[PDB]
Amino acid sequence: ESSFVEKMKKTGRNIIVFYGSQTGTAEEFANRLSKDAHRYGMRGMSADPEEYDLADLSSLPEIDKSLVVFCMATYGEGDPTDNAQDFYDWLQETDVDLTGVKFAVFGLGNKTYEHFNAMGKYVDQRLEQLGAQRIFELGLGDDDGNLEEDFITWREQFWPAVCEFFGVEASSIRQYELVVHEDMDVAKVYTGEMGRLKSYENQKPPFDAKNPFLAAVTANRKLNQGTERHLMHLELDISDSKIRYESGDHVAVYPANDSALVNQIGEILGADLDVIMSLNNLDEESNKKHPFPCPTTYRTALTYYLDITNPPRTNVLYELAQYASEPSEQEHLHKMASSSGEGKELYLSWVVEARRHILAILQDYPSLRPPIDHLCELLPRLQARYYSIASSSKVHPNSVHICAVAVEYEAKSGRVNKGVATSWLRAKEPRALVPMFVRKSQFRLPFKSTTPVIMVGPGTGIAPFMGFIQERAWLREQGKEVGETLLYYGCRRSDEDYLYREELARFHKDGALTQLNVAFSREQAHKVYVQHLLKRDREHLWKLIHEGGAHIYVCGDARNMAKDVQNTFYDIVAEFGPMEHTQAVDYVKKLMTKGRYSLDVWS
Numbered sequence: 001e002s003s004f005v006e007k008m009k010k011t012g013r014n015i016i017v018f019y020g021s022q023t024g025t026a027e028e029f030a031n032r033l034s035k036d037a038h039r040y041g042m043r044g045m046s047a048d049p050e051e052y053d054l055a056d057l058s059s060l061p062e063i064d065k066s067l068v069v070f071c072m073a074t075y076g077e078g079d080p081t082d083n084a085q086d087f088y089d090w091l092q093e094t095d096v097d098l099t100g101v102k103f104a105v106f107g108l109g110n111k112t113y114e115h116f117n118a119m120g121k122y123v124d125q126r127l128e129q130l131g132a133q134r135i136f137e138l139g140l141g142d143d144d145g146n147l148e149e150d151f152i153t154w155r156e157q158f159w160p161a162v163c164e165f166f167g168v169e170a171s172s173i174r175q176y177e178l179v180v181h182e183d184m185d186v187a188k189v190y191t192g193e194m195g196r197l198k199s200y201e202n203q204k205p206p207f208d209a210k211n212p213f214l215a216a217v218t219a220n221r222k223l224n225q226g227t228e229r230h231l232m233h234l235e236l237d238i239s240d241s242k243i244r245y246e247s248g249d250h251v252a253v254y255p256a257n258d259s260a261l262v263n264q265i266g267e268i269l270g271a272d273l274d275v276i277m278s279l280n281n282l283d284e285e286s287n288k289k290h291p292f293p294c295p296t297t298y299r300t301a302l303t304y305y306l307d308i309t310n311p312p313r314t315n316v317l318y319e320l321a322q323y324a325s326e327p328s329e330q331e332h333l334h335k336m337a338s339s340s341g342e343g344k345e346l347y348l349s350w351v352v353e354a355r356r357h358i359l360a361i362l363q364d365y366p367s368l369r370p371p372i373d374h375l376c377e378l379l380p381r382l383q384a385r386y387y388s389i390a391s392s393s394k395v396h397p398n399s400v401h402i403c404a405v406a407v408e409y410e411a412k413s414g415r416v417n418k419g420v421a422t423s424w425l426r427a428k429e430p431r432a433l434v435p436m437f438v439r440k441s442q443f444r445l446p447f448k449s450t451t452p453v454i455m456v457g458p459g460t461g462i463a464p465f466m467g468f469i470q471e472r473a474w475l476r477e478q479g480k481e482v483g484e485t486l487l488y489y490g491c492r493r494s495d496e497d498y499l500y501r502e503e504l505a506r507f508h509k510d511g512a513l514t515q516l517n518v519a520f521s522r523e524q525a526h527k528v529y530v531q532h533l534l535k536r537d538r539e540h541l542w543k544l545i546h547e548g549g550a551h552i553y554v555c556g557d558a559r560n561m562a563k564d565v566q567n568t569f570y571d572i573v574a575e576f577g578p579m580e581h582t583q584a585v586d587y588v589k590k591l592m593t594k595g596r597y598s599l600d601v602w603s
């Protein structure tokens with residue numbers, strides 16, 4: 001009658017989503033989620049928390065193999081959507097014991113806001129505190145970029161997880177049907193292009209992401225003197241493309257999977273890699289006509305369109321589960337999709353940590369040979385790799401310069417893995433082309449040259465700063481007056497990986513670089529980092545930042561370097577403020593919204 005647990009017994013439901021929308025979205029999902037409830041020996045209903053009193057969750061253990069999904073959108077200061085208000089205030093003042101209740105939450109938000117997903121995160125952790133049994137990890141949907149994905153990527157893994165737990169079954173269900181060709185003009189077949197059919201053969205402007213330019217490699221060289229790593233310098237020709245860049249922009253390139261890696265797939269798969277085929281969307285009523293540009297051969301798809309390198313998501317292994325002859329190896333592939341337990345352990349342990357790519361999985365689980373085409377629909381799309389530009393538009397504006405470290409590590413899975421973009425970018429011979437484009441950014445130098453410039457950026461992070469310390473040196477030699485120009489670079493040793501040593505000490509000698517504070521981390525007994533050298537110079541630095549009106553730039557790995565360095569500045573703004581931490585932060589805060597502090601971090 002009222003207890004929404006009872007309105008489920010009279011209807012035969014064993015699952016109920018709860019939209020917490022305020023402008024649509026949430027409910028949209030809530031439904032679409034329980035409308036799938038069918039395909040898996042279950043059936044749900046999407047209800048609104050406003051009505052039925054939620055305190056009735058305690059009745060949920062009455063229905064067998066019951067579940068409850070939450071789709072809460074977040075508004076204002078972590079404010080709970082209007083209809084979720086009561087459910088919210090309840091979750092706080094309450095103390096009821098929701099033991100046995102199985103759940104899962106999927107919040108919607110937008111990183112742009114301070115309290116990002118404060119609602120989805122609360123209704124999530126607040127249930128566990130009351131004694132729930134999280135069935136699947138919290139879903140953090142971020143509208144800012146793309147929400148549908150986040151959700152689709154979440155539901156893509158949610159169900160196989162609700163199965164391995166509850167017991168329900170699937171039923172394959174392909175998303176594309178195959179169509180092979182016994183003719184096709186070789187000139188109406190995709191062979192690596194990204195958009196325009198033949199835009200790689202007849203390069204026609206304007207050049208951007210949808211239609212990349214094929215820059216030629218004028219020079220490729222080993223920047224580091226060490227031999228444990230391979231840092232290189234790539235120069236790409238952009239002459240004849242009107243592609244105008246600026247120090248501080250990124251240059252994205254479209255890699256080609258590994259020749260040997262690819263071909264070595266068809267072999268163990270026992271498949272004809274050169275059959276000009278075409279995947280069609282079983283839902284003619286949509287944009288997504290094909291997963292990748294078709295018609296094309298498989299070989300081309302695994303080379304320019306598919307990502308056969310990053311470890312497969314739990315769901316992809318769970319859908320490839322079937323194509324395993326063994327009853328043992330399949331059992332595994334199924335478990336990986338576990339929400340928790342030794343299944344997830346193994347997953348993170350055997351797949352994500354060990355770093356087993358698809359070919360690796362096909363060879364360690366031999367009784368697993370999926371039909372080629374299906375696989376070429378389960379794998380994700382090959383992604384473009386971005387790099388920070390080491391050149392200056394004021395200097396050679398026809399050569400996009402790249403500085404980047406090659407990936408090639410012995411993996412926990414036995415074999416040695418190589419980077420798709422870096423391995424591919426290492427073999428180019430100085431006509432070798434490099435599909436690419438430029439991504440405009442907000443990483444720029446000051447308008448007025450007189451403005452001081454502090455640049456913190458170790459290792460391959462030096463990159464953007466070389467572009468800078470070339471445009472600054474240009475301006476000097478071009479009449480204009482240039483303010484100070486400090487640099488805080490770092491590495492392991494000087495006889496190992498001291499990048500652009502001559503190019504640098506060269507600029508120091510002439511003026512481009514007022515100072516070249518380099519922090520080696522393995523020269524001496526202990527460790528030395530670029531945040532120590534800032535602390536040391538805090539004295540000077542405060543004055544450049546405070547009175548000088550300098551701009552700051554930090555660039556390199558986002559993980560620890562970005563964090564530790566920025567910490568130091570807080571310590572600096574506070575010591576010489578004087579002000580308490582927070583105080584200090586809001587100083588750097590505004591500097592950010594000013595353009596005097598700017599991050600070009602990546603990890």
Ligand SMILES: Cc1cc2nc3c(=O)[nH]c(=O)nc-3n(C[C@H](O)[C@H](O)[C@H](O)COP(=O)(O)OP(=O)(O)OC[C@H]3O[C@@H](n4cnc5c(N)ncnc54)[C@H](O)[C@@H]3O)c2cc1C
Pocket residue numbers: 250309355385386387388403404405406407409411418419420421422423460463601602603
């Ligand atoms: C805005 C932006 C700018 C960038 N600028 C640069 C730049 O200037 N220079 C540069 O070198 N890179 C830069 N990168 C990183 C670069 O795009 C690639 O990540 C790098 O070239 C690696 O090869 P892939 O490009 O082929 O990477 P992949 O082959 O796809 O491999 C990347 C993955 O390899 C794994 N990996 C790496 N080392 C190990 C290890 N020891 N053990 C286990 N797994 C490991 C990780 O899982 C990592 O996610 C940037 C990224 C962004 C988003």
Ligand SMILES: NC(=O)c1ccc[n+]([C@@H]2O[C@H](COP(=O)([O-])OP(=O)(O)OC[C@H]3O[C@@H](n4cnc5c(N)ncnc54)[C@H](OP(=O)(O)O)[C@@H]3O)[C@@H](O)[C@H]2O)c1
Pocket residue numbers: 405458459460461490491492520521522529530531557559560561564602603
């Ligand atoms: N778990 C680990 O063992 C570990 C640790 C750090 C980074 N990494 C990985 O390696 C990548 C680094 O990029 P890269 O190869 O281009 O860098 P890199 O050129 O090899 O190194 C750049 C410089 O940063 C230093 N550094 C490391 N941690 C730092 C910290 N917390 N604060 C300040 N400086 C620090 C390095 O010292 P050292 O080489 O002596 O550490 C080195 O001098 C990261 O993306 C990260 O994912 C892994």
Ligand SMILES: Cc1cc2nc3c(=O)[nH]c(=O)nc-3n(C[C@H](O)[C@H](O)[C@H](O)COP(=O)(O)O)c2cc1C
Pocket residue numbers: 020021022023024025026027073074075076077078079081108109110111113114115116117118143147
């Ligand atoms: C006034 C307003 C405030 C918002 N505040 C936040 C917020 O603090 N945190 C967050 O993660 N998202 C915030 N969002 C984004 C929404 O949560 C997101 O767009 C969500 O998809 C809306 O879902 P709905 O259509 O189901 O109501 C806000 C949106 C508006 C219009």
